[PDB]
Amino acid sequence: AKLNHPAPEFDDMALMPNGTFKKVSLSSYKGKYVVLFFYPMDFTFVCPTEIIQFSDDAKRFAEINTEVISCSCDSEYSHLQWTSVDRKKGGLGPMAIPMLADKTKAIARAYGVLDEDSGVAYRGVFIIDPNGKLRQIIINDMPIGRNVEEVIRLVEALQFVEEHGEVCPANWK
Amino acid sequence: AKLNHPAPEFDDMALMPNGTFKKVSLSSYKGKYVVLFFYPMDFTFVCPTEIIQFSDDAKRFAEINTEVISCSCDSEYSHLQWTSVDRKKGGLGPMAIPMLADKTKAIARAYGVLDEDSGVAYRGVFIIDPNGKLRQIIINDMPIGRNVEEVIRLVEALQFV
Amino acid sequence: AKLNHPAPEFDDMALMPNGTFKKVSLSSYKGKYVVLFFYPMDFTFVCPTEIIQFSDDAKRFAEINTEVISCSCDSEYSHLQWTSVDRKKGGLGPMAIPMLADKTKAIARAYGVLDEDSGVAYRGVFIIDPNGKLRQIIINDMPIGRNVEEVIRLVEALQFVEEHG
Amino acid sequence: AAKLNHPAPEFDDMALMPNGTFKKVSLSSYKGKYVVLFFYPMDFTFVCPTEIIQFSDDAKRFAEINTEVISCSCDSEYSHLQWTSVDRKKGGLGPMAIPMLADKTKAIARAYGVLDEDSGVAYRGVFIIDPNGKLRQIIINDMPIGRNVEEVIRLVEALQFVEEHGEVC
Amino acid sequence: AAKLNHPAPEFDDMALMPNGTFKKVSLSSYKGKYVVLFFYPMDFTFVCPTEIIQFSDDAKRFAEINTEVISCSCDSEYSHLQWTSVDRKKGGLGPMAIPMLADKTKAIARAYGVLDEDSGVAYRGVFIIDPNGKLRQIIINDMPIGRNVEEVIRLVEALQFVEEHG
Amino acid sequence: AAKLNHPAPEFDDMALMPNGTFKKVSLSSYKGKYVVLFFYPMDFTFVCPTEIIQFSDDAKRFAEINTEVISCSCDSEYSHLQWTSVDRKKGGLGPMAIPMLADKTKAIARAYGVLDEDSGVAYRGVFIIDPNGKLRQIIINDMPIGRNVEEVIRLVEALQFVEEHGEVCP
Amino acid sequence: AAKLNHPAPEFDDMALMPNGTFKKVSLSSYKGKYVVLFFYPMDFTFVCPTEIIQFSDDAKRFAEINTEVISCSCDSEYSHLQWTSVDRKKGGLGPMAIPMLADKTKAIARAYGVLDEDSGVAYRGVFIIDPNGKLRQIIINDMPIGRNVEEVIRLVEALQFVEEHGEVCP
Amino acid sequence: AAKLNHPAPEFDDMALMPNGTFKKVSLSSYKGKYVVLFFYPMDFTFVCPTEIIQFSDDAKRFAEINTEVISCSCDSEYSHLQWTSVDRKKGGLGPMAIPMLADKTKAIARAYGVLDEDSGVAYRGVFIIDPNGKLRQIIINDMPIGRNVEEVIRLVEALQFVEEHG
Amino acid sequence: AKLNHPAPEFDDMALMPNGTFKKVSLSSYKGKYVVLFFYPMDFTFVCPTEIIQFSDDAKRFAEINTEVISCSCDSEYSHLQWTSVDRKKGGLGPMAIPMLADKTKAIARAYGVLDEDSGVAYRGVFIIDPNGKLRQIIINDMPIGRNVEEVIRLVEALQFVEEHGEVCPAN
Amino acid sequence: GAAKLNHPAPEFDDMALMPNGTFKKVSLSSYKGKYVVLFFYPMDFTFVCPTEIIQFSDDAKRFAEINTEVISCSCDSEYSHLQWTSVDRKKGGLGPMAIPMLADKTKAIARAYGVLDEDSGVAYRGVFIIDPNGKLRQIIINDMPIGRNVEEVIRLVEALQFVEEHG
Ligand SMILES: [Cl-]
Ligand SMILES: [Cl-]
Ligand SMILES: [Cl-]
Ligand SMILES: [Cl-]
Ligand SMILES: [Cl-]
Ligand SMILES: [Cl-]
Ligand SMILES: [Cl-]
Ligand SMILES: [Cl-]
Ligand SMILES: [Cl-]
Ligand SMILES: [Cl-]
């Protein structure tokens, strides 16, 4: 998993937005920016605010040619049980984001986000560009939530450089 | 995982009967017969049953110096979400059996029950004696339920000797 | 010896039902369900029963497209001699089941049923489906008999999922 | 390389102190405080500063929260100095409140897996080491994408929060 | 398989004693007497119990000359018994005066290089170990060729002659 | 090693023919007849002819039953000759009806696992190869224990018996 | 690694051209002229670029004799520039007539075996490559010992002398 | 390898002393003074003594500055002598004030990486070892390019300067 | 088998001068010069003249502190048998030299005189000095006889270099 | 080094100081057709032992008469050989030789014939006889202080030829 090197190919089951079970692959997205992010387990004893925040800003992301997708070492079936429970009662409720499920752990390992000791992933976030290359690495510890707006900043930031020929200094725009 | 050889030691999180999260080890049971059995996934579409049958006959088992315990590659959490949901609505409802969760897959592998290709365990059932030795191996395919009464027969049968 | 993976091919001498000595192979059964089961030694001091039960329910099994066959690390000749003694006097008497004899131990090892230390097999039972794939593993300790009815349950159970689902 | 929740890779090498001295700094020196190690490619880069500076400035604000920060690049201690002498106003860097590591050896960049073996310089990497000396945050930005110092802070504060809550007896 | 004038391969396994007991016999047990170890393929044979018996009979004659004899095959101690129960008259074996080794393990056959890895049984092998525990005679007959027990004796006497005078 | 029912180890080396020539003999030459290969330690031993001779004599009797015999030792073809020149009466060997192999190389002794690496000579080994070139009998006597030629015959006849009908076991 | 009379190690990396451009220079570019490659530790030193400069100055004199010269150090192309902007009068370097290689990779220093793995910088090395691209002179001074540019010339001239005729002395 | 600022490769071999003796010289013997070791291809080469000689002459001048010099080639101690006997005037070498190493073994040439494995002779190498026995200067001239002894001196003086002061 | 290095130790059966069978070792000779020489086979068709020449000059050798001994890959018994035949009838007759017999071939190999292909040794001749070191190697092809006088010359020559410090050049 | 008997002798190809005064690279294959006598000596201006070297040079004629060519070899330079050939035999020199003098500065040859004393770096008094077919047929290695007997070398060559001619 190096930068400016084709991101690790992932191909596995995912709980589509609606309710289908489709096998998703990173090559599917060849053409758009992709935001892959990981989370430890599913039926978390806290506020799925993090996972959700992405699902919500999903629209806002799509607006900027970027698709996002989650991932964890839980079963496609486990995802749904969680998507069935109402967001109001500690559930997750319908997501606008596909939810990867690598029961194999092959993906977590590929991105070096897996904690071999526990068997779950860290709060990782990667941004793959339209050409299929990895261009951003971020790995938060297990209790530290992420800032979705930042992810966006970064994406926009990346696109800026693709559009024009200059770079982006500290705290951009 | 050989017969008449100390069963593979397992030590991992388990959803106790009540609702606690306790790390259970096979050595904890040193003194009683143990019945370890595996199942693929948790919120299995259409398939619950089997797991329950064990939880119920749990009493009947305890009666004969044997404790039973489940196991699957699902999280202590994703599964709980399954002890509270009502048995009536495809749920599982309170279990009298501790439910092992090896997110690590270390246990499934140890008993050679893991399907490396899918990442889940087959319907395996093992019987460890009071001295901590493995004395019975049974591995059913993914769609073939087990007969709990038989497991008992076997345990009683073992004790007879 | 993994599940849903083509069962280990066995090809060795077997004491046919009648009295002939024929070399049997697992591929011969390609088309029917097969029940392979092992037992330690031949004459022993109380180990009839189990072996027989299979031979008897043999008919009942055949009724459900399944053939059964035994196996142990004893010679084809030792099998015969045991089949000659009358069931009534601790013997075995005519079997409706072919009796494999792997003097080589190649089979016991293939199914991971051999106790390398003693040189004999554990009470193992496997069910191969018509496509030649292993679909059930059962290994009982040396002193624990098996329940043939259960084996059937399992076979029927397997077939059920074949038709439906 | 470096894993999370595992003692961060020890670094021990020359650094251009805030004032103007040349002192060999080590990660163990900071055992007790949170540390923010961040990398940048080269030194007299037309627009690599800005980012570098922001840290130097928020240095005070960081110190306020028990965290010390330090830069690093594959340039010479002397090259750092020279860059520090030029006035911030004329594309320079001007006095920093941050020590500036210089691993001419590239040993550090490699240790944190931030080195681009092909070019020989480091990517915009940022790591947060806790007071116990363990790595707890990884961030690697591409060569043209600046970082958001405020976020680093958020993260540090965030980490500390979790420390305070849930504990001893 | 084994070398001459070199301590014979140690064997330690179950054997169907003369009477009817099941005792674990070892080659070291015989340290002091000459030993005749001989192998045979399978147990409930066809026409070859002859050979096995001849030894059992000349067992007395052998003992007379400080030599003990013992058989061996890859069949179970229980299979040996069952064969010893059938009356010699009806193709059986009947009571033997010789212990009958049973290496279900095949460890012995291999040690003497008498095992046919392909079939899993031993060839008609015969070895003579001296009182000091050293191998001093090797003989391996094909599967269908019987042995001449008198010869084995000749050999033993022959060996003793040499140790005697010199 | 080489084993039973497996093509016997091919040997190809100098031998002191019956008459007095020096010919290189090979086991394949005999493809068609039974062969009896037997070894002996050294040549001018103070008591090793007895045995060697017996074979030479029963050579005729053997030939009668489609079997050829041949000796072998780690001595030189020339050493064999010498020994053959001395009259049997004076501890010699006298003309043999059997070819006498000489593997100065020791390649043969090793091939049949009859060589005592420590001393460099062979043990009293005797092997019977069938007409198809397969080894069917192994016998290795210690250095001081003579062999019984009649037995070798018994065994050959015995083998042939089974090649015609079912099987023997006297 | 680098041997004499063997094609010099190929170098291909960024260099701060005389004027002010950033061009990737390669040793093959010079195929045809004699080249003088010389190393120096670091860029902004408390020393006097005298050594580095002397080359830049005699650059003309060198060119006069079909030889091009080029520096190299493990500092960034940007660092070179910065050092080139400072006026020679104030401890700077000032415009150079020589391209200044920058191997941030250290690949070059290693190739010529001038790198001090421990510190990460190069020793005062000087090599002379001939028009055919072969290495013909090795010189490695310690870190504090300056070089004598005139000598480098002597050597070049000396080498050329042999090219036309057939042998030289001191 | 022979690296800078690392103890120079120890050399210990026969050398034709100034006078005419054959003594085995070692680099440790010089521990205390600066040493100038220099190599040359072969011995009786029609042209290119000159170089070797220049050193012998400036030997005095060198000694004046705490430095001893010594030559080396893959030729025999005897071959050196024979060359020293011929009068400098007739293409000879004549008495040298410098010990002349002879590594018939080639061990030395290799140690300093001056050997041309293909031909079997050394290149015009010159190394300066400091009083602590460390290598501080490397110079390797091609086979046809003479060296400038004055420079070697410059370098030595130069080295000493940095030592004194600093 | 290098020069000026302790000769390869040999320890094996040898047909003593008289008629005994004694196991001889090179260390036994520690103190005298030893001449070890090999020959292919025993009862060859060609005249043993070479082997014999040594046995005869044995006396002359002994006179100069040197003992000589033969060796071949033939059995001690075979040597015996060859020694009984009268020299006159192509035999060898009593030897004044011990005759080594390495049925093992270990010696021949040790001195690099064995022709692995045939199994016999080449006409090799080695001279070991009193300190047990090898000081002369000579290996003649199978059909080329040796010149015993030369072996002597060499021994004397070696000894000369011992008494005096000077060297014994061409002759 | 491997130099077995009845096996093609180790090929040598290296500078040699020809009889006259030229420097020519000689090879063992050049002699394919004649018998060759290769012999080694330690060093060149050796305090003594040229006598040995010379004897060969002289009997060179006598050797040639019997289809055999001889050639020396040592680890000294071609130039060193020359310089030794210039000094008059009368004053401890060598004087014009009728034999080519190999010079293996590389030591490749000494090693090939297993005549090199790795410790000192020079060769032992070795002498080998190669037959016209290029096979080695005689090995002789004398210690450093023991001179050789050229007549014997001849005896051997003649001896070899005899066996060739006959059978
Ligand atoms: Cl990277
Ligand atoms: Cl098992
Ligand atoms: Cl499995
Ligand atoms: Cl990690
Ligand atoms: Cl043996
Ligand atoms: Cl066998
Ligand atoms: Cl070089
Ligand atoms: Cl260096
Ligand atoms: Cl040598
Ligand atoms: Cl040889």
The DSSP H or E segment spanning C82 is helix C76-84
Which residue type does G135 have? Answer: L
Distance from CA of B110 to the nearest CA of A (A): 16
Query: How is residue D26 written in tokens?
Result: 């080590």
E-chain CB neighbours of F123 within 8 Å are 4
Strands B66-72 and B99-101: parallel
Query: How is residue B154 written in tokens?
Result: 């076997």
Q: Which residues contact G122 (CB under 8 A, 6 or more apart)?
A: G39, G40, G41, G72, G73, G74, G109, G114, G115, G116
Question: Cα(D112) to centroid of ligand 1, in Å?
Answer: 9
| Residues 103-162, chain G, touching H (beta carbon < 8 A) | 116, 123, 136-142, 144-146, 148, 151, 154-155, 158-159, 162
Residue C139 contacts residue B125 (beta carbons within 8 Å): no
Beta-bridge partners for I121: I114
Distance from CA of B44 to the nearest CA of A (A): 7
**Minimal CA–CA distance to H42: which of H2, H93, H95?**
H93
* Cα-Cα end-to-end distance for chain A: 29
Touching subunits for chain J (3+ Cβ pairs under 8 A): H, I
Residue F74 contacts residue F112 (beta carbons within 8 Å): no
On the CB side of C165, CA atoms within 13 Å amount to 13
Distance from CA of J69 to the nearest CA of H (A): 27
I-chain CB neighbours of F122 within 8 Å are none
- What total of structural domains would you count in chain J? 1
- Minimal Cβ distance to A119: which of B42, B103, B120: B103
Residue C37 contacts residue C71 (beta carbons within 8 Å): yes
Q: Which residues contact D61 (CB under 8 A, 6 or more apart)?
A: D153
Residue F92 contacts residue F52 (beta carbons within 8 Å): no
Query: How is residue D90 written in tokens?
Result: 């004329």
Residue contact C82–E78, C-beta within 8 A: no
- Residue from H45, H76, H103, H105 to probe the interface with J (highest J Cβ count within 10 Å): H76
Rounded to an integer, what distance in angstroms lies between the CA atom of residue G115 and that of residue G39?
10
Q: Distance of CA I52 to CAs F83, F135, G36, J4, Å?
A: 22, 46, 77, 27
Residue E13 contacts residue E47 (beta carbons within 8 Å): no
Q: Do chains D and A touch (3 or more CB pairs under 8 A)?
A: yes
Which residue type does J153 have? Answer: V
Sign of CA dihedral H89, H94, H96, H100: positive
Strands B33-38 and B123-128: antiparallel
Domain range for J31: 1-167
Residue E112 contacts residue E1 (beta carbons within 8 Å): yes
Residue J69 contacts residue J63 (beta carbons within 8 Å): yes
- Region label for G106, one of left (φ > 0), alpha (ψ between -120 and 50) or beta (otherwise): left
**Minimal CA–CA distance to C71: which of C27, C15, C18, C17?**
C15
Query: How is residue C75 written in tokens?
Result: 């010679």
- For C9, other C-beta atoms within 10 Å of its C-beta total 11
Rounded to an integer, what distance in angstroms lies between the CA atom of residue E8 and that of residue E131?
11
Residue of chain D with shortest Cα separation from G13:
D119
Residue G133 contacts residue G6 (beta carbons within 8 Å): no
Let me know how long chain A is: 173
Residue D125 contacts residue D114 (beta carbons within 8 Å): yes
Distance from CA of I146 to the nearest CA of F (A): 22
Please tell me what DSSP assigns to residue F127: E
Residue contact G75–D75, C-beta within 8 A: yes
3 state DSSP class of I137: strand
Q: Which residues contact C160 (CB under 8 A, 6 or more apart)?
A: none
3 state DSSP class of A113: coil
User: SS in 3 state form for J114-147?
Assistant: CCEECCCCEECEEEEEECCCCEEEEEEEECCCEC
Question: Cα(B20) to centroid of ligand 4, in Å?
Answer: 29
**Minimal CA–CA distance to C67: which of C155, C3, C159, C153?**
C155
Rounded to an integer, what distance in angstroms lies between the CA atom of residue I28 and that of residue H77?
41
Rounded to an integer, what distance in angstroms lies between the CA atom of residue E18 and that of residue E95?
7
D-chain CB neighbours of G91 within 8 Å are none
User: SS in 3 state form for C8-77?
Assistant: CCCEEEEECCCCCEEEEEHHHHECEEEEEEECCCCCCCCCCHHHHHHHHHHHHHHCCCEEEEEEECCCHH
Residue contact A45–B74, C-beta within 8 A: no
Q: Which residue has the tokens 């055999």?
A: J68
Rounded to an integer, what distance in angstroms lies between the CA atom of residue A94 and that of residue A82?
9
Touching subunits for chain E (3+ Cβ pairs under 8 A): C, F
Residue I167 contacts residue I161 (beta carbons within 8 Å): yes
CA A130 to chain centre: 15
Query: How is residue C161 written in tokens?
Result: 């999922």
Residue I119 contacts residue F104 (beta carbons within 8 Å): yes
Residue of chain J with shortest Cα separation from H14:
J120
Q: Count interface pairs C-E at CB distance under 8 A.
A: 60
- Residue from C117, C123, C154 to probe the interface with B (highest B Cβ count within 10 Å): C154
Question: Cα(G80) to centroid of ligand 8, in Å?
Answer: 24
Exposed / middle / buried, residue E117 (Cβ in 10 Å: 0-12, 13-18, 19+): exposed
Residue of chain E with shortest Cα separation from C45:
E78
Query: How is residue J119 written in tokens?
Result: 């410790």
Residue F127 contacts residue F155 (beta carbons within 8 Å): no
Residue I47 contacts residue I78 (beta carbons within 8 Å): no
**What is chain H written as a DSSP string?**
---TTSBPPP-EEEEE-SSS-EEEEEGGGGBTBEEEEEE-S-SS-SS--HHHHHHHHHHHHHHTTTEEEEEEESS-HHHHHHHHHS-GGGT-----SS-EEE-TT-HHHHHTT-EETTTTEE-EEEEEE-TTSBEEEEEEE-TT----HHHHHHHHHHHHHHHH--
Q: In the PDB record, what is the listed experimental method?
A: X-ray
User: SS in 3 state form for chain J?
Assistant: CCCCCCCECCCCEEEEECCCCCEEEEEHHHHECEEEEEEECCCCCCCCCCHHHHHHHHCHHHHHCCCEEEEEEECCCHHHHHHHHHCCHHHCCCCCCCCCEEECCCCHHHHHCCCEECCCCEECEEEEEECCCCEEEEEEEECCCECCCHHHHHHHHHHHHHHHHCC
User: SS in 3 state form for G108-170?
Assistant: HHHHCCCEECCCCEECEEEEEECCCCEEEEEEEECCCCCCCHHHHHHHHHHHHHHHHCCCCCC
- Minimal Cβ distance to I136: which of J54, J142, J159: J142
Q: Do chains B and D touch (3 or more CB pairs under 8 A)?
A: no
Query: How is residue J22 written in tokens?
Result: 């030229």
Distance from CA of G125 to the nearest CA of H (A): 9
- For A49, other C-beta atoms within 10 Å of its C-beta total 10
Q: Which residues contact J59 (CB under 8 A, 6 or more apart)?
A: J150, J151, J154
Strands J35-40 and J68-74: parallel
**Minimal CA–CA distance to G138: which of G148, G130, G147, G128?**
G128
- For F114, other C-beta atoms within 10 Å of its C-beta total 23
Backbone angles phi and psi of H60, in degrees to 5: -60, -55
**Minimal CA–CA distance to F104: which of I116, J7, I83?**
I116
F85: domain CATH number? 3.40.30.10
Residue J57 contacts residue J24 (beta carbons within 8 Å): no
Q: Which residues of E32-64 are buried (b: 16+ CB within 10 A; e: fewer)?
A: eebbbbbbbbbbbbeebbebbbbbbebbeebee
Query: How is residue G46 written in tokens?
Result: 């408390």
Rounded to an integer, what distance in angstroms lies between the CA atom of residue J79 and that of residue H86?
15
Which residue type does J104 have? Answer: D
Which residue type does A167 have? Answer: V
**Minimal CA–CA distance to F137: which of F33, F16, F34, F19?**
F34
Q: Count interface pairs F-I at CB distance under 8 A.
A: 64
Rounded to an integer, what distance in angstroms lies between the CA atom of residue I93 and that of residue J116?
42
Question: Cα(E53) to centroid of ligand 6, in Å?
Answer: 24
Strands C11-15 and C21-25: antiparallel
Exposed / middle / buried, residue B126 (Cβ in 10 Å: 0-12, 13-18, 19+): buried
Rounded to an integer, what distance in angstroms lies between the CA atom of residue G94 and that of residue G84?
5
Residue contact A138–D136, C-beta within 8 A: no
Residue C140 contacts residue B136 (beta carbons within 8 Å): yes
Per annotation, catalytic residue among C14, C47, C108, C125? C47
Residue contact H5–G139, C-beta within 8 A: no
**Minimal CA–CA distance to C36: which of C107, C118, C95, C93?**
C107
- Region label for H105, one of left (φ > 0), alpha (ψ between -120 and 50) or beta (otherwise): alpha
Question: Cα(E35) to centroid of ligand 5, in Å?
Answer: 18
Q: Distance of CA F109 to CAs C33, I75, I108, Å?
A: 55, 16, 19
Q: Which residue has the tokens 């024929």?
A: C22
Q: Which residues contact E79 (CB under 8 A, 6 or more apart)?
A: C41, C42, C43, C74, C75, C78, E43, E44, E102
Rounded to an integer, what distance in angstroms lies between the CA atom of residue H151 and that of residue E96?
104
Is some CB atom of chain H closer than 8 A to the CB atom of J92?
no
Is some CB atom of chain D closer than 8 A to the CB atom of A49?
no
Residue contact J55–I161, C-beta within 8 A: no
Backbone angles phi and psi of D165, in degrees to 5: -85, 135
Exposed / middle / buried, residue H118 (Cβ in 10 Å: 0-12, 13-18, 19+): exposed
Rounded to an integer, what distance in angstroms lies between the CA atom of residue J52 and that of residue J74?
13
Per annotation, catalytic residue among B47, B52, B106, B158? B47
Residue G112 contacts residue G38 (beta carbons within 8 Å): no
* Cα-Cα end-to-end distance for chain J: 31
Residue of chain A with shortest Cα separation from D162:
A143
Exposed / middle / buried, residue D74 (Cβ in 10 Å: 0-12, 13-18, 19+): buried
Rounded to an integer, what distance in angstroms lies between the CA atom of residue J83 and that of residue G69?
43
Q: Which residues contact I46 (CB under 8 A, 6 or more apart)?
A: none
Query: How is residue H112 written in tokens?
Result: 């300093």
Residue F143 contacts residue F124 (beta carbons within 8 Å): yes
Question: Cα(H116) to centroid of ligand 7, in Å?
Answer: 6
**Minimal CA–CA distance to I170: which of J58, D163, E27, A134?**
J58
H-chain CB neighbours of J75 within 8 Å are 104
Residue E48 contacts residue E146 (beta carbons within 8 Å): yes
Sign of CA dihedral E96, E97, E103, E104: positive
**What is D49-112 written as a DSSP string?**
HHHHHHHHHHHHHHHTTTEEEEEEESS-HHHHHHHHHS-GGGT-----SS-EEE-TT-HHHHHT
Residue G116 contacts residue H1 (beta carbons within 8 Å): no
Stated in angstroms to one decimal place, the resolution of this structure is 3.2
Question: Which residues have a C–N gap over 2.5 Å right after them in chain F?
Answer: none
Which residue type does H77 have? Answer: E
Residue A68 contacts residue A100 (beta carbons within 8 Å): no
Is some CB atom of chain B closer than 8 A to the CB atom of A78?
yes
Query: How is residue G32 written in tokens?
Result: 């045809």
Q: Which ligand is nearest to the CA of H124?
A: 7
Rounded to an integer, what distance in angstroms lies between the CA atom of residue G16 and that of residue G14?
7
Largest CA distance in chain J: 48
